[PDB]
Amino acid sequence: SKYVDRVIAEVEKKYADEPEFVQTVEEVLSSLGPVVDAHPEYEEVALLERMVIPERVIEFRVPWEDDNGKVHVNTGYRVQFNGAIGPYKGGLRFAPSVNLSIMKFLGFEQAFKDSLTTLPMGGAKGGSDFDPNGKSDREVMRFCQAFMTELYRHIGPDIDVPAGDLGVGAREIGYMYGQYRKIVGGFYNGVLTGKARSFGGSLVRPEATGYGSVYYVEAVMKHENDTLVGKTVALAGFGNVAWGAAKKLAELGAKAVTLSGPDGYIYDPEGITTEEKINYMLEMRASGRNKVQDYADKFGVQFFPGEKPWGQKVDIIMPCATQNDVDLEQAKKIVANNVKYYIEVANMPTTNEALRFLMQQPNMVVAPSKAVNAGGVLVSGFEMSQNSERLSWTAEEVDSKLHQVMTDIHDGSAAAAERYGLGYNLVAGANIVGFQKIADAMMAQGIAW
Amino acid sequence: SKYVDRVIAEVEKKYADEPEFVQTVEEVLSSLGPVVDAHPEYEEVALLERMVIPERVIEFRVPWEDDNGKVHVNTGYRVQFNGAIGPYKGGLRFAPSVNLSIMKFLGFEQAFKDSLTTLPMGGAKGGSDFDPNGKSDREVMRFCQAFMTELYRHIGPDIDVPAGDLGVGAREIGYMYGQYRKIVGGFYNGVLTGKARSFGGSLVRPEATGYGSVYYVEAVMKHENDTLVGKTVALAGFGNVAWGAAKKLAELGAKAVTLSGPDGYIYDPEGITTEEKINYMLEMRASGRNKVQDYADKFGVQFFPGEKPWGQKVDIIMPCATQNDVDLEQAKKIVANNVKYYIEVANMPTTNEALRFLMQQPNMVVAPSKAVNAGGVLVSGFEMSQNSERLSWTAEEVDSKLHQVMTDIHDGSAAAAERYGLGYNLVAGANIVGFQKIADAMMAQGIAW
Amino acid sequence: SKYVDRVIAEVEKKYADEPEFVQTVEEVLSSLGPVVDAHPEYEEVALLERMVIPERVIEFRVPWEDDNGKVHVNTGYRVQFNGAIGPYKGGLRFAPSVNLSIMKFLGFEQAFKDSLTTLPMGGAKGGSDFDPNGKSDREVMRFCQAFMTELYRHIGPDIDVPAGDLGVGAREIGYMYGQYRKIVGGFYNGVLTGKARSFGGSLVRPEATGYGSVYYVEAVMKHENDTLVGKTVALAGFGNVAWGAAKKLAELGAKAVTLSGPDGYIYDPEGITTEEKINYMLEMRASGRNKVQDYADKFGVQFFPGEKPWGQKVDIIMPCATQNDVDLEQAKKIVANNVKYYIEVANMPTTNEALRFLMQQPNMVVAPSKAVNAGGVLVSGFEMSQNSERLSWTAEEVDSKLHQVMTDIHDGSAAAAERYGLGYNLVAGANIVGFQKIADAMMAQGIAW
Amino acid sequence: SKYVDRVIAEVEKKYADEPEFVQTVEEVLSSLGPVVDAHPEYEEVALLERMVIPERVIEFRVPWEDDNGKVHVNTGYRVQFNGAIGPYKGGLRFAPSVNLSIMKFLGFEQAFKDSLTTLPMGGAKGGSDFDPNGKSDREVMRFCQAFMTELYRHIGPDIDVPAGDLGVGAREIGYMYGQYRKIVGGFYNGVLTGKARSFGGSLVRPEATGYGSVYYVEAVMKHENDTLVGKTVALAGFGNVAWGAAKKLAELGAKAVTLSGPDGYIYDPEGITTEEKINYMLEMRASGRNKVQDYADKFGVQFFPGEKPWGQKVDIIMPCATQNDVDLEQAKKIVANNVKYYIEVANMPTTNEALRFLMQQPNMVVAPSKAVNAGGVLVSGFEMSQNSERLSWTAEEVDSKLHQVMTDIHDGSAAAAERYGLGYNLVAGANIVGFQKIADAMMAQGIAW
């Protein structure tokens, strides 16, 4: 589509200094050509040009004092990218690399991911260049208070609902929420999600991302007249997502056979499928040692230091740890191994070069992270519902809806790709399904945003 | 000061992509060494590190529709840099070059300028990459409405009071204000300054910047046991500031002998000192022709196309038009001419290379724009007072205070430079006087911002 | 002006059921032809069509309980007609005849009157069909509380500042204000004017309307190379306005020779010029007897029952009591008497037939009430200034400004009439001066309201 | 008055547990008998019963963390006692004895004091049982932030304007204000008074209480056909008030001859009348040593440890330090000495027994602190005016109004006492003048508060 190409070119030029953002826009917009060409009305109201500029961006100063009385200064961000279909929604990331480029790219993708859930959630991202590494609990608390002392005026249960991400977990959400309720003088606990149960968090929260990713893979098997049962799976990490996936894979008849750490990776041909094995991951996580070897030492399984587990021959690859984990190098190994299922779980775990490549392979099934990991934000949506109803749902209620939605995200994507003649292209399908709802809403709302 | 050098280095690295901002910080902070070295307490509360990061930055999407029904999208900014001593305050600039770097640099300087006025005004800057050139009146109106539809929630008479700048005049202020009062449902006319008289603008508004700059030069003459009477002056432009200065120079016994346009410059040895001559500038401005030749055609005076008037031998140089007007090339001519008085009137009309150079010259007097052009923002402060009192002052009241303050800005700067042993360095003096009030306020307010 | 005629015709048709409003619009708009014909731009933005429709109208239910526990229901109004040049401003009228027509007509005229003061005040009117006659003090208090319990959300010191009118005096203003400050939880005493001194009322309040009307007449004498000294004056009423006028006439060398009541009128060839005489009016007012005879009984002066004092031969006629007091019948007597000065003081004290007639008389000077009685609202403006400054001015400060403004309202009107070639037509002049400021502001504010 | 006696009896019974409050009510109400007996209408609307119950009381939890990371908990109060004539107004006291009783008594008296100023200021008091003694600057800052994090929602420039008192000075006001402006997102610097100049404090602030007390004494001399010149004066303390009084006494021809400290008192027959002597007080204050001996060591003047200076024979006694300083014991010495002028400067520096006693003495002049020390709150009122006008007044403007008002507070009190036949009773006169304005306002505002 000439219209699409034109917007990408203008973006590339205007936001040259924001490489991460430019690439994401290109990647998403480029898959929408067929849809946009079928809707000339979009161009007339400059829809794409509007979409690529966040509704509102806020940056602010965050001075705070350490345990020694020294004053530090960081910068806080919240990018409220698109609120056409629900209050802004998206996690908070505290990491020294954080800048506007990275917030806009994650925030643009968040809009598409949130649109897929089928719930009324807009897209946003925020965070700070504050580095939680090595800070005391008390230091993290004062930072969170000073961060919220400004942030509170831009968010709220019907406006913008943040949540956790890298560097931001239950603990930080708790401290921010305490400051919020104090300043505002009321409860409004739907202002943040990822909360502890005592003040409104949802059951299935910890399992959400991981289980969700397995329900999606299940819908993939079905599509392909195949089965999870018996399948082996390579994971990355030993964290939350990895824990949740391993757990549900095992329950489903499958088994994970690898985990990974900055120190290397393990191989466990038996499968991280026991209560004892599965639970230990929590331990290692706890431990704060940050080494995957511990599992190998504990269970007496292979530990290959300084190596990715992308070389092992398995049925399914699920990268659930960090960005740009799988590169060309690793993709080629995966290919060579004749792995059919490549399922992104963590955010942007694959480089593009790697992605196109995997995508050129005819026999392969490639699932994009914005769809596969939607389970967590989907449970954040259920948490906002529970908070608005002022009650809790049972675990069975939450898990059962989680399950039905993840299946629909898969099926919907396929149907959409197929409709625009793209085959079984889950990557473009996720983009298309996500874009359509947003477009419909923006077109109906007129030219205001 | 090691502390100062350290903050400049961290700024240079962190905001590499914001060259204009980096340079301004270096230029201002570097002159404060003596003051900072005398106040060790500043470093303990990380004062400079706080100061260089704006309290709050807001960017937002601005879709709007042209006379033909085509939809355009621009981006709006408001950088609320420092509000320690008054509501945020600073102009709006509509120009296609506008970006965050430029907003932060003008907004950082605005804090120092506003601090010098002696009135309670903080520092901010905002605007859009919208280009008013070639737009209809109706188009500018719809843009201003859509811009304000988001902006209103961040400003207010006690919070942030914008005003005009490049691309933003009475007309735009009028349209934004109409939208504001409609959305908010009340009067609150102190929300913007630069208003027309019918709805609360102040007398002496149009003359403000120009007259103020002449009262300052007057205080310079006095300092130097000299006199305006008889002096000749090179101006740049034929606009508002130039008009106001010429006018007051003439009244004071002096006379301007040049004006300037993108087309060249004129020389008028008699002096733009008559009602007829003086008033014609308004005409040319009106005319929208944008040519200084008109004056030469009209009055039959020299017109040197494609040339700056920096070569003419005069007593006083007052650049009142555009940035980086006076470069090394032009400074060397000025030097060669044995001009003692170089008085910046327009904002950053001189490059640094040019500035250091002029500043190395022992016999010369160099006045920085943040002090010299304070007259306009000073009248904006009087306008907020009048609006808060719900009455108007007479022209004599406003002009008489304008006069006394500009004298004090000069005298104060000198005294300050002298105190820290810098001689009669009006440039560092302006920075020091401005910084001190802000520092005092931030130190008293604690570590919150 | 064809444009003017067209708007009047559309008004007449659309608001047929609002006779009082239709007539006022016609009367005012018809005098603006020359101004509108000189400004084609007005028609392009449909300025007059906008002006004739109030920005906002609010009507509301007012249940309240009497001293016997019976529940009564009345209706409350506030018409916020035009706020282009200041917060809405205008009195509250409690009378059983009150309806929307009457509120809109008084509110449209209030905009023009407020514009003449030269202060930033918009135009509004409000009130209720509640009848204070025969109610207890306690009943009036509960009514005022219930009326304010809804009204408070539409007004405020920067939004809409009501004040007294027929049926609403200091006492009612006090009760409404008490309810306001309780609901809102703060002071904000600039929300209402006409307050008692103890909580922010202004000195010269009681004298305001009356004195103002005499300062205006003074400017008329000057215009006409004449003098107040020695002049005799027919007043109507024995109330506030009459009291204030008599008082200042006497001080100025003149003397009133009549007063009036529903019972008839008195004639006092000596002049209501003594402390004893002057003060007695207050008595009669107090007395609540409502009879002008009391003065005649007390001072032993003529009392002609059931008669208007419009028949007495005097230098100046100043009707300061009720509407449509002076009719054709009375105008013809005035004419026959060769009275040159006819000065409306009370609101619409003359019927139109009467007005045109007086206006056709070549030798006569006719002053419209919107200008002549501006003194009261002008002191309400000074009260808002004092409240905003959080201090009181002295009586001399208030009276001296009152005086200078009333002179300017006269002079300005004359100059304006003369400019559009209308002669010394104070009636059209008041309309023109008032309209111009409002137009300027609306044109500058764009098409929002 | 039976009505008065009845309200005192009901107060005594209902607030038995609040001794300080009960006594103050009795003391004030008992002097109002004559006024109340002249206004039967008061009893009908239960005016006194309303007056003795604060409009609103707020208490709140204040957790905060010390320099060692230990968590402390204190309690915060704000009693908004009466807002009939202006926003609530009154200081903040941080001392371990603070409780509701003490807040209500100081807050009830504050209403009467504020009413005397003639400015629109209501009456309030607040504070905490937090003890600033021995805390670090950083600790006081965190406390002030946590205190304001709750307090901000109850105050504001038009609602309730706190200020300093025991334990709360410029430094604490600065820290609270910084937190306020951060939470609220705007300037609103009129929210607190006693601010540093850099962010809106008024000139003459430090001198205010002391100078004011001397202008009042001056009006007393005049009343009594006497003179300050030559008079000697016993002060108490070496603080702010003492410094200000000594200073102005000296300028006026008088001289202080004593100062006092917890360590004893000094006698300086020459007079603390030199720049050197006067300025040294600041030193001692600074020093934080808390000993008056320093002055005696420095100037070589008598130092009587563990003794009050109430025994020295002087013309005028001005207790300017602490409560219940002058007891029966000290009063008897004063009496014995034939001192005619007893002028309370500090708050409640005299016990009642002592007060009645002094008051029974026929030849003596006794001035109550609520009137004499009104100078400070009067300058706080001028500061709110300056902040609302968004400018500064000169020192001469502030001092000259200070002077005229203090004279009026004296004269007004005398006239009032005399009117109700009480003689020259400055104590009852202050109560009566204060009560009358408040009563007038409450009666006009109806039964809402």
Ligand SMILES: N[C@@H](CCC(=O)O)C(=O)O
């Ligand atoms: N950080 C997760 C959770 C966000 C949310 O729950 O709002 C994400 O990227 O979706």
Ligand SMILES: N[C@@H](CCC(=O)O)C(=O)O
């Ligand atoms: N644009 C002018 C005016 C700003 C103002 O009046 O706030 C400046 O740079 O100062």
Ligand SMILES: N[C@@H](CCC(=O)O)C(=O)O
């Ligand atoms: N009722 C008066 C006073 C209104 C006011 O003071 O706002 C009028 O018609 O002007």
Ligand SMILES: N[C@@H](CCC(=O)O)C(=O)O
């Ligand atoms: N604490 C002083 C000052 C209070 C104020 O300025 O509001 C008093 O008791 O009056």
